[PDB]
Design an enzyme around this catalytic site. Structure first.
Site, PDB file in Angstrom:
ATOM      1  N   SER A   1     -87.669  24.806 -13.816  1.00  0.00           N
ATOM      2  CA  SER A   1     -86.986  23.822 -14.654  1.00  0.00           C
ATOM      3  C   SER A   1     -85.795  23.230 -13.901  1.00  0.00           C
ATOM      4  CB  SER A   1     -86.519  24.470 -15.958  1.00  0.00           C
ATOM      5  OG  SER A   1     -85.765  23.565 -16.742  1.00  0.00           O
ATOM      6  N   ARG A   2     -85.817  21.920 -13.671  1.00  0.00           N
ATOM      7  CA  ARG A   2     -84.789  21.284 -12.851  1.00  0.00           C
ATOM      8  C   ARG A   2     -83.433  21.232 -13.546  1.00  0.00           C
ATOM      9  NH1 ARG A   2     -86.828  16.106  -9.664  1.00  0.00           N
ATOM     10  NH2 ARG A   2     -85.131  16.937  -8.357  1.00  0.00           N
ATOM     11  N   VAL A   3     -83.462  21.193 -14.875  1.00  0.00           N
ATOM     12  CA  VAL A   3     -82.250  21.178 -15.691  1.00  0.00           C
ATOM     13  C   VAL A   3     -81.630  22.564 -15.780  1.00  0.00           C
ATOM     14  CG1 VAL A   3     -81.311  20.775 -17.984  1.00  0.00           C
ATOM     15  CG2 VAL A   3     -83.152  19.314 -17.110  1.00  0.00           C
TER      16      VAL A   3
ATOM     17  N   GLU B   1     -82.525  11.150 -13.139  1.00  0.00           N
ATOM     18  CA  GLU B   1     -81.737  11.457 -11.953  1.00  0.00           C
ATOM     19  C   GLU B   1     -80.858  10.285 -11.530  1.00  0.00           C
ATOM     20  OE1 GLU B   1     -85.019  12.882  -9.379  1.00  0.00           O
ATOM     21  OE2 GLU B   1     -83.979  14.814  -9.405  1.00  0.00           O
TER      22      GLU B   1
END
Ligand SMILES: Nc1ncnc2c1ncn2[C@@H]1O[C@H](COP(=O)(O)OP(=O)(O)OP(=O)(O)O)[C@@H](O)[C@H]1O
Ligand SMILES: Nc1ncnc2c1ncn2[C@@H]1O[C@H](COP(=O)(O)OP(=O)(O)O)[C@@H](O)[C@H]1O
Ligand SMILES: [Mg+2]
Ligand SMILES: [Mg+2]
Lengths: 64, 110, 470, 65, 485, 236, 121, 122
Positions: free
Chosen positions: E349-351, F69
């Site tokens: 999960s990038r968050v 992003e």
């Protein structure tokens, strides 16, 4: 309590769903009835073969 | 003669009649007949190598240098729209019989 | 009568183009007929190319068609016989009798093409279905009125499997059944018809409880692509109009896509990935949707699926999973070991695989068996590279059991008795669960593995282990 | 299109239909059949009771596990 | 007329090419003489290609067709809640006509660069292995990728059920309306899926956009966008909406079918070049609106079905590239018992913590560590006791930490119940307990707290954090139960 | 004739760089590793350093940039100081959302290139052009050439791929007036370097600054890996 | 005995392509299956009423690199009542004829085998 | 006129698009002026697609084409025993004419489901 609600509302919603179905149907046969009276308008009315060459020769022109 | 194919000319010249281009549509239609008899034409009027909207352009060259252009600069694309350039000579014949019915179908008061 | 005449204008393989007159074009999915000295070559409308030209799909041999033969419009989709009149008789795709029993006297004729039941009509059930097969009733049990799938490559055991189900459900079912052979060996039908007479299911001079529809592989692409519908229509009738339980057996269902895949190219369809036609999901969809249970009647369906090149990633098999409640995957890697039916216990799942359905006890026992067989397969890299001695005390004890249960899953079918030589054995679900349970507790760690190979009930295991000792 | 405009012809035919009071115009026995069919699906959806009526209720006793 | 009407030149494969309509718009709806409708995707100089929403048996040659002057639109608003509609937005459950507060175009442009905020509002799924390991955030796009029959729906499904904890409350900025998008699934499945949410009282705040496999391809094409708008409503008005696309794989197949039949250029695996533009223009619609925009938010959980773990395929590569994390699931892990089988190794999960409760973050920061070293020393577990004590310790934890993540289906737990289980696991108060009794450990432990230390649980639920006082109070209560055990 | 006859090193400001994998003045550098390694932090750095040592501006170009992003980037850049609203900014932003059609996606790069060449030929500065990610640029082309009808090459990529790549990389070079150094990220399709897209990209790359997780794990910032980071200007 | 259907399909593939008929997979005609299906089904055991006559068939296929997962071979494996797989590798090992029992099966099985030989094995 | 005959429009690679033949059947045998026989597989309004059993260096544009009226069949019976024939059933071993008892078509319907027996003979 929830059951009384669901059941009554259910009885109510029935009338709407029905009503809705009637409308749809009818307006099917209604707009479709359009078809068979317009296929009768061109196939018949030899004066709806004149309004043929008409609107159509107004094609060649515009495009160019 | 049949009807559906003969109606093509009558359904195109119908507008022509109102003007009186029967001469420009009947004399032109005669061209389409000779074009089919042309062996070299058979390899162009029925060549699936060209395209659906490409071959239609090359037609203009035979529509602006043969006789067509006015009452035939529409029937030309239509004649080569689906591929009815094989038995089209039959459609032209009907024009000769339909082009004679237009003379009588007019308010002859003068 | 006022029929619409037509004339053939093109003939390419199983694809026939007819040229009608203006205002006289038949809608899509309409049947056609062409009189021949031998019989009748029914056609099926497919597309409208334009210019009063329609493209149909030859329901039979196209050889013998003359450029411009007059075609008679049926005026509606292919009609098949329905009713208890079709019971105990063999029928092809066109709905004509092919058993030499004369004409099929049906009160109605219902088209093979119809819309899928409404979302409102859909009825969910949770009832379980007892077949008699251990590996199934214990792991992935089939649901009453549910859709079953028998996946498996070539020569795994899909036919024998589905055949046993008939030998244990069909007689034991107080209702009607419909078998539909799609793209298979004509000889398999023959044997089937013979067994239905001998079992008593089909009586020529009596009553019957099953209809037979065959459209085998010997038939052209047109036939195999619509034979599935022909038999579906006969089932569906008993569903709504008769309002009673019905068993639908389809074998094989893969021929339905394949058959269509052959002609899709000739119908001017750009081949999709893997060569299949773009209309795969929809076609596969409009068939499975119809095969289902409504509030009018219950229909239990047993469709055997073919797996091309033992590859499950293939679109045909892959798409079919979503239309199934219970899936019984067969692995060739299991056949070769001698253990049959070569059912994969991990990959095979079910809908009724819930505690609140099969019982709490049933779920736990089933889960233990799965975990055992998994670790076994996980240690396969150690049992060959380091031996059995390297394994821990907990491991060796498990491994032995995993081998016993594995061989304990095999069961002799009365159908394949000619292959195994051992008399069929039907195990009850109530005893099945009680058997593995006992083996999971280690109550038979003394009995030899060969005592679990090809054995029915748990009692037979002990009986066998004692007969060998002699 | 300018000729294309002459909408008129559609309205007129709308008009004659709409001007007609005697059920749904040009019956055909099918209408009722279809009607009834859909009237039946809704029964399936909504239940087998008299939807013209207020509902009865007999309640379940409680249940203990 | 020729400008508002047209004649069918050719029909087939659920696609009919009509002639005329010289003023028809792009992707505009149209109506045939029979009644079936369609939309023109291809606009050629000579003819116009139009897809069908119904059987092509109704459409014939020369048949008349008229415009609708409207692009694909669907009615949105809070009236849909508790209903079941199709791609178009009509009722199929039989509960009467729908009450929408307006309509929105199937095709809506995603929020611009400026009108957004860094996700910061956690989306409690009620899954321990998720909320602890891969945290999801309001506005995030977390992908549920996995082979067939792995537990992909289970993840989402439990998530929805775990929302009764806030939706039946009073505060709105805390609730979360759920929008499920059934694509390519048989009716029987939907009818059951719906029937499950009801037996749990979840339909009260769930919207079902059913798109069965028997329905025309375009329906399965518009379903995701239709449902997309429906949820955006909540997002625009300043709320929170969770939409699960199950599954995008089926959608692409449908779209591929239309594209091929229309004779558009075929790409890798028979997918047209605009297939990526499809999903990218869908997922980017969900986000986190800024304070000025309404602070509203739309979360997306797209489902992708791989073919034998092949994440390298075309479709998956597209989706995985757009989303913001995956919840990879493997059948193998499923067989072992680990359910849900969420491959911690791949799942990411990038968050991350940005959208995870600090109450759980304080005990989860380390849980990713142990598990990480466990996967490396997992081969040693197969060998004799000859393993040194150092590595052995890892095995002791991993076996137990992995056993804790095993959570039964339809049984979501609140954060107040997760922290106590994670805290006891990380420190190692279970190492002394048998690896067979780990299951019953959770049961008897929770019931203990809710009767003797209820004050601690409730403080974690409200504060959402763990003060030095709680950390000590929680530890003392744990060691006490482990002792008496 | 306008090309240089000698490659020179471009002082960045990082020991891990100048000593190990130095940046080529007007060359192409490959940046590996996604979020988690402080990629963004390593980018804004090069923009500051060069702005103080060479005083050359920077241009960031995003092809199929995630709208999410893109937001957090812009905002972060205002917090670091690389971009000041009231004062003077040092880097220009040109994003190309993913929800945009292939047409736009395949041109985003050229858009950012143009702006950069301006400060090369006009002001003659050592401008840095950042592209993230060079991979979606090839993908963009592949979708465009796909719709046009052009037949698909090997692996599915466009035949014209070879020429397109050059119509972007060649334009980034050191001239007699100024210079443009490209710092573009690289994505390896299915961890395979045999693939055309990567194969073609590397053919222009002169250096590679890898960012490993295991490097930032040891508390080493930046997360630049000394072993993987290599340069074609690492000779006596 | 057909030897071999693998070539026949190549031949039939040639007429299709040349007649400008769209190819399926690997250029083979869509109905390539129907090519061998309506061929092999023609051989079978007839009823006593018919004459007790019979026709046995031994189709032959040519794989490449031992790949039985191929297009044509799979098409035929599905129709035939079993197959006598022959491996090159077993041939050198000295197994001649190199019949791989592991993969060679007969669907008719012992029914067809001689009764005497059935007992001993 | 062209009902029983036709003129060749193109030819090459063993394929011959003949024009005419509007009474020829599907998969029917035909004979060209050259002597070489052919088989009709594609029936279209414009032309008919025919495949050649021999070389095509003999067929040329505008050649006459005649039909056989019969589906491609081959001689059958015990006579063939010991003889070596070709597709069509003609002798290629050089040992006299093929004494056949009957002639059956190339494409024959598979035996029925009813007229079958389970295999028991080794
Ligand atoms: N957390 C869980 N605990 C126990 N059983 C589970 C769990 N999750 C899933 N299952 C089991 O998984 C089966 C269905 O799995 P699931 O629907 O999650 O996979 P899926 O992603 O929907 O696969 P498909 O694409 O075939 O629908 C059910 O039989 C159920 O028993
Ligand atoms: N119960 C069984 N025990 C052992 N072998 C079996 C069993 N059932 C089927 N088989 C094997 O499978 C073969 C038949 O395969 P079949 O059912 O036709 O598979 P498929 O569905 O792939 O064609 C038989 O020859 C037999 O050898
Ligand atoms: Mg079989
Ligand atoms: Mg699912």
């Amino acid at each position: 309590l929830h059951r009384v609600y669901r059941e009554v509302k259910n009885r109510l919603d029935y009338h709407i769903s029905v009503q809705n179905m009637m409308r749809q149907k009818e307006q099917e046969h209604m707009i479709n009835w359009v078809e068979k009276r317009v296929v009768q308008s061109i196939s018949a009315q030899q004066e709806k073969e004149t309004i043929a060459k008409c609107i159509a020769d107004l094609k060649l022109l515009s495009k160019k | 003669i049949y009807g559906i194919e003969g109606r093509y000319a009558t359904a195109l010249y119908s507008a022509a009649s109102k003007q009186n281009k029967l001469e420009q549509v009947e004399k032109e239609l005669l061209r389409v007949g000779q074009i089919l008899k042309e062996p070299k034409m058979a390899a162009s009027l029925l060549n699936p190598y060209v395209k659906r909207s490409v071959k239609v352009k090359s037609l203009s060259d035979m529509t602006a240098k043969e006789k067509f252009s006015p009452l035939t600069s529409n029937l030309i694309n239509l004649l080569a729209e689906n591929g009815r350039l094989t038995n089209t000579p039959a459609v032209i014949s009907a024009f000769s019989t339909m082009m004679s019915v237009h003379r009588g179908e007019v308010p002859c008061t003068v | 009568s006022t029929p619409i005449t037509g004339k053939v204008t093109a003939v390419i393989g199983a694809i026939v183009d007819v040229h009608f007159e203006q205002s006289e074009l038949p809608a899509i999915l309409n049947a056609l007929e062409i009189k021949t000295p031998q019989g009748k070559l029914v056609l099926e409308v497919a597309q409208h190319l334009g210019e009063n030209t329609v493209r149909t799909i030859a329901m039979d041999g196209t050889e013998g068609l003359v450029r411009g033969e007059k075609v008679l419009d049926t005026g509606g989709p292919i009609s098949v016989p329905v009713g208890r009149e079709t019971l105990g008789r063999i029928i092809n795709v066109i709905g004509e009798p092919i058993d030499e029993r004369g004409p099929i006297k049906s009160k109605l004729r219902k088209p093979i093409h119809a819309d899928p039941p409404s979302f409102a009509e859909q009825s969910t059930s949770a009832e379980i279905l007892e077949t008699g097969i251990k590996v199934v009733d214990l792991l992935a049990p089939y649901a009453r009125g549910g859709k079953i799938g028998l996946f498996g490559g070539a020569g795994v055991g899909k036919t024998v499997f589905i055949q046993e189900l008939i030998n244990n459900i069909a007689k034991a079912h107080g209702g009607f059944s419909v078998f539909t052979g799609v793209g298979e060996r004509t000889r398999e039908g023959n044997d089937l018809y013979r067994e239905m007479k001998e079992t008593g299911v089909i009586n020529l001079e009596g009553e019957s409880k099953v209809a037979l529809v065959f459209g085998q592989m010997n038939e052209p692409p047109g036939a195999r692509a619509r034979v599935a519908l022909t038999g579906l229509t006969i089932a569906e009738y008993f569903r709504d109009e008769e309002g009673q339980d019905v068993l639908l057996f389809i074998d094989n269902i893969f021929r339905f896509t394949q058959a269509g895949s052959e002609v899709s190219a000739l119908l001017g369809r750009i081949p999709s990935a893997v060569g299949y036609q773009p209309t795969l999901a929809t076609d596969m969809g409009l068939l499975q949707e119809r095969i289902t249970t409504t509030k009018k009647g219950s229909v239990t369906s047993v469709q055997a699926v073919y797996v091309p090149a033992d590859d499950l990633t293939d679109p045909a098999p892959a798409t079919t999973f979503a239309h199934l409640d219970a899936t019984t995957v067969l692995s060739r890697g299991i056949s070769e070991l001698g253990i049959y039916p070569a059912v994969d216990p991990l990959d095979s799942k079910s809908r009724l695989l819930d505690a609140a359905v099969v019982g709490q006890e049933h779920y736990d026992v089933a889960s233990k068996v799965q975990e055992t067989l998994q670790t076994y397969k996980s240690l396969q890299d150690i049992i060959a590279i380091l031996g059995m001695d390297e394994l821990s005390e907990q491991d060796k004890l498990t491994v032995e059991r995993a081998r016993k249960i594995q061989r304990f899953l095999s069961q002799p079918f009365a159908v394949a008795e000619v292959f195994t030589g051992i008399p069929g054995k039907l195990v009850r679900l109530k005893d099945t669960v009680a058997s593995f349970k006992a083996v999971l507790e280690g109550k038979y760690d003394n009995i030899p593995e060969h005592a679990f190979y090809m054995v029915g009930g748990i009692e037979d295991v002990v009986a066998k282990a004692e007969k060998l000792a002699a | 299109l300018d000729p294309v405009q002459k909408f008129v012809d559609k309205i007129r035919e709308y008009r004659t239909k709409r001007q007609t009071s005697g059920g749904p115009v040009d019956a055909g026995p099918e209408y009722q059949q279809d009607l009834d069919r859909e009237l039946f699906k809704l029964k399936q959806m909504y239940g087998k009771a008299d939807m013209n009526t207020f509902p009865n209720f007999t309640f379940e006793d409680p249940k203990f596990e | 007329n020729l400008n508002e009407t047209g004649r069918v030149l050719a029909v087939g494969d659920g696609i009919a090419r009509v002639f005329g309509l010289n003023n028809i718009q792009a992707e505009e709806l149209v109506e045939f003489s029979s009644g079936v409708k369609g939309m023109a995707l291809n606009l050629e100089p000579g003819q116009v290609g139009i897809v069908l929403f119904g059987s092509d048996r109704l459409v014939k040659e020369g048949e008349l067709v008229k415009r609708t002057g409207n692009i694909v639109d669907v009615p949105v608003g809070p009236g849909l809640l508790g209903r079941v509609v199709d791609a178009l937005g009509n009722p199929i459950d039989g509960k009467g006509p729908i009450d929408a507060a307006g309509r929105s175009r199937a095709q809506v442009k995603a929020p611009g660069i400026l009108p957004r905020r860094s996700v910061h509002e956690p989306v409690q799924t009620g899954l321990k292995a998720v909320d602890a390991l891969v945290p999801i955030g309001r506005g995030q796009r977390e992908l549920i990728i996995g082979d067939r029959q792995t537990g992909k729906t289970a993840v989402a499904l439990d998530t929805i059920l775990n929302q009764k904890r806030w939706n039946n409350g009073s505060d709105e900025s805390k609730k979360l309306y759920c929008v499920y998008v059934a694509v390519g699934q048989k009716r029987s499945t939907v009818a059951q899926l719906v029937q499950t949410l009801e037996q749990h009282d979840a339909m009260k705040y769930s919207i079902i956009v059913a798109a069965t496999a028997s329905e025309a391809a375009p329906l399965q094409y518009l379903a995701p966008f239709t449902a997309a708008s429906i949820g955006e409503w909540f997002r625009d008005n300043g709320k929170h909406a969770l939409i699960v696309y199950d599954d995008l794989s089926k959608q692409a197949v449908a779209y591929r079918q239309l594209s091929l039949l229309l004779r558009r250029p075929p790409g890798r695996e028979a997918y047209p070049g605009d297939v990526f533009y499809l999903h990218s223009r869908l997922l980017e619609r969900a986000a986190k609106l800024s304070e000025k925009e309404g602070s509203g938010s739309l979360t997306a959980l797209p489902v992708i079905e791989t073919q034998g773990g092949d994440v390298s395929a075309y479709i998956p590569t597209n989706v995985i590239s757009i989303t913001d994390g995956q919840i990879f699931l493997e059948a193998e892990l499923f067989y072992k018992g680990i359910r849900p089988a969420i491959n911690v190794g791949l799942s990411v999960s990038r968050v991350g913590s940005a959208a995870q409760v600090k109450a759980l973050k304080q005990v989860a920061g380390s849980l990713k560590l142990f598990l990480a070293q466990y996967r490396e020393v997992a081969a040693f577990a197969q060998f004799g006791s000859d393993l040194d004590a150092s590595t052995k310790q890892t095995l002791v934890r991993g076996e137990r930490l992995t056993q804790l993540l095993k959570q039964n289906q339809y049984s979501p737990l609140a954060t107040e119940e997760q922290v106590p289980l994670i805290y006891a696991g990380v420190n190692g108060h279970l190492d002394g307990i048998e690896l067979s009794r780990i299951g019953e450990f959770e049961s008897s432990f929770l019931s203990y707290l809710k009767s003797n230390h209820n004050e601690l649980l409730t403080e974690i639920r409200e504060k959402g954090e763990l003060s030095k006082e709680l950390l000590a109070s929680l530890k003392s209560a744990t060691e006490s139960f482990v002792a008496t055990f | 004739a306008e090309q240089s006859t000698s490659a020179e090193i471009l002082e960045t400001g990082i020991k891990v760089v100048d000593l190990l994998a130095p940046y080529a003045r007007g060359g192409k550098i490959g940046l590996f590793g996604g979020a988690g390694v402080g990629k963004t932090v390593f980018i804004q750095e090069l923009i500051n350093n060069i702005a103080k040592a060479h005083g050359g501006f920077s241009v960031f170009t995003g092809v199929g940039e995630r709208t999410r992003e893109g937001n957090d980037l812009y905002r972060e850049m205002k917090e670091t100081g690389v971009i000041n609203l009231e004062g003077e900014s040092k880097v220009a932003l040109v994003f190309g959302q993913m929800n945009e059609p292939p047409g736009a996606r395949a041109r985003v790069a050229l858009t950012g290139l143009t702006i950069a060449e301006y400060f090369r030929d006009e002001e003659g500065q050592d401008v840095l052009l950042f592209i993230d990610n060079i991979f979606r640029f090839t993908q963009a082309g592949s979708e465009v050439s796909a719709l046009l009808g052009r037949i698909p090459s090997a692996v599915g990529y466009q035949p014209t791929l070879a020429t397109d790549m050059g119509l972007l990389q060649e334009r980034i070079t050191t001239t007699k007036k100024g210079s443009v150094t490209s710092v573009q990220a690289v994505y390896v399709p299915a961890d395979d370097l045999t693939d055309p897209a990567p194969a073609t990209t590397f053919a222009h790359l002169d250096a590679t600054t890898v960012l490993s997780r295991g490097i930032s794990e040891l508390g080493i910032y930046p997360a630049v890996d000394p072993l993987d980071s290599k340069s074609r200007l690492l000779d006596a």
